[PDB]
Amino acid sequence: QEIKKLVDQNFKPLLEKYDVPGMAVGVIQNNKKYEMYYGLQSVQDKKAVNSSTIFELGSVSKLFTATAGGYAKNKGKISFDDTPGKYWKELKNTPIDQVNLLQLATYTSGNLALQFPDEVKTDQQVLTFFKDWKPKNSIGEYRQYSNPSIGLFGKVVALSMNKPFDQVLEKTIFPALGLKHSYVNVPKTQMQNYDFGYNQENQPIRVNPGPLDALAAYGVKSTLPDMLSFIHANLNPQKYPADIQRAINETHQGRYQVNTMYQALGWEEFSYPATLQTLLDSNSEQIVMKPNKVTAISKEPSVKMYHKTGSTNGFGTYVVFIPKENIGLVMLTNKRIPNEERIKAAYAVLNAIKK
Numbered sequence: 001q002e003i004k005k006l007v008d009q010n011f012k013p014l015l016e017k018y019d020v021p022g023m024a025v026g027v028i029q030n031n032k033k034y035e036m037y038y039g040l041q042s043v044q045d046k047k048a049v050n051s052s053t054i055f056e057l058g059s060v061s062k063l064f065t066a067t068a069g070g071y072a073k074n075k076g077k078i079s080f081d082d083t084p085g086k087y088w089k090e091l092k093n094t095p096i097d098q099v100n101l102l103q104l105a106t107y108t109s110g111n112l113a114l115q116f117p118d119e120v121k122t123d124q125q126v127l128t129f130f131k132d133w134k135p136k137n138s139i140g141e142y143r144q145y146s147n148p149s150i151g152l153f154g155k156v157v158a159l160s161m162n163k164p165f166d167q168v169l170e171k172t173i174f175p176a177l178g179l180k181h182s183y184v185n186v187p188k189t190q191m192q193n194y195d196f197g198y199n200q201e202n203q204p205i206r207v208n209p210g211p212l213d214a215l216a217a218y219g220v221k222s223t224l225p226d227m228l229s230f231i232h233a234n235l236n237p238q239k240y241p242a243d244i245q246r247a248i249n250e251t252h253q254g255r256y257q258v259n260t261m262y263q264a265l266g267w268e269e270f271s272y273p274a275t276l277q278t279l280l281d282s283n284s285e286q287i288v289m290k291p292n293k294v295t296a297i298s299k300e301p302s303v304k305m306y307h308k309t310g311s312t313n314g315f316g317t318y319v320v321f322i323p324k325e326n327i328g329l330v331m332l333t334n335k336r337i338p339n340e341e342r343i344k345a346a347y348a349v350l351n352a353i354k355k
């Protein structure tokens, strides 16, 4: 059916249900990008949420970190066999130097939790944290979703490219993807487009930023048109120059499975058609918060789909795409809503515009 009708039926009611100030929903189908905006970027200013509004992607940032890692790997700047001390020399001869880069990128070091400790903020505190790290579970065998893990991966990628991570994205990866308003650090010239998001009590929220390396885990900001372009790049990598094409495709390869979920670089991958329950289970407390023993991949699914949720204190994100149907969807909000609502609403929309 018409995309607007399906988005109105499935996404629009979430604004009233969760008191969300503004939502941007994009659908790409047959290489045509459709944008739908509801509500306000700023409640106080009566400023409509729009195609220039900048949203925090939360953990969808990890898809850009993955793309940077795929870009570096396919240019020979890193091997996924390498360990972090080859690039971050102060980690040589430490226990974390037994973990390879793929294991860090896919959360299988065996002893890294969701967040850095609160007291770890400066670059020295991060280095000391990794120098003091010791193994717990067998390396490679257990997935524990982890911002420090992919943060160390991103730091190594940046070192291998002789640029800080913010510049890896802003000077290399974002331009190669054709993104015009995606940032690690939003400049003052974009201030009118980047308002605080809203906490659960509808108050504009900010916190002090955490360690710089965690920007690779949750620190990217973008707009709906740029996210639609990023989905287009994931659906149609042959339209892009060869180096970024290789980087995008690197992020699609499953590295191991946990139940019905395959862990790719950044992306979560599923056999397609996937049931709603499979997609919901990927965001369950068991998978997101607890360690789970991985299963090596023997047969990667021949027909696949991919998704990722992201959240920050003030913002919600969901992205999903299905190569066989040549369709994808992006949802951005300036207030968190439950992941299950994001996944269900996207499932209802994409299931009806299949072709």
Ligand SMILES: *[B]([O])([O])[C]([C]N1[C]=C(C([O])=O)N=N1)[N]C(=O)[C]SC1=NN=C([N])S1
Binding pocket: 058, 059, 060, 147, 207, 218, 309, 310, 311, 312, 313, 314, 336, 339
């Ligand atoms: B990511 O979005 O997966 C990641 C972990 N996570 C999941 C959820 C959820 O399900 O609501 N919340 N966190 N996101 C982060 O670690 C965000 S950390 C920050 N949030 N706000 C900041 N200013 S930093």
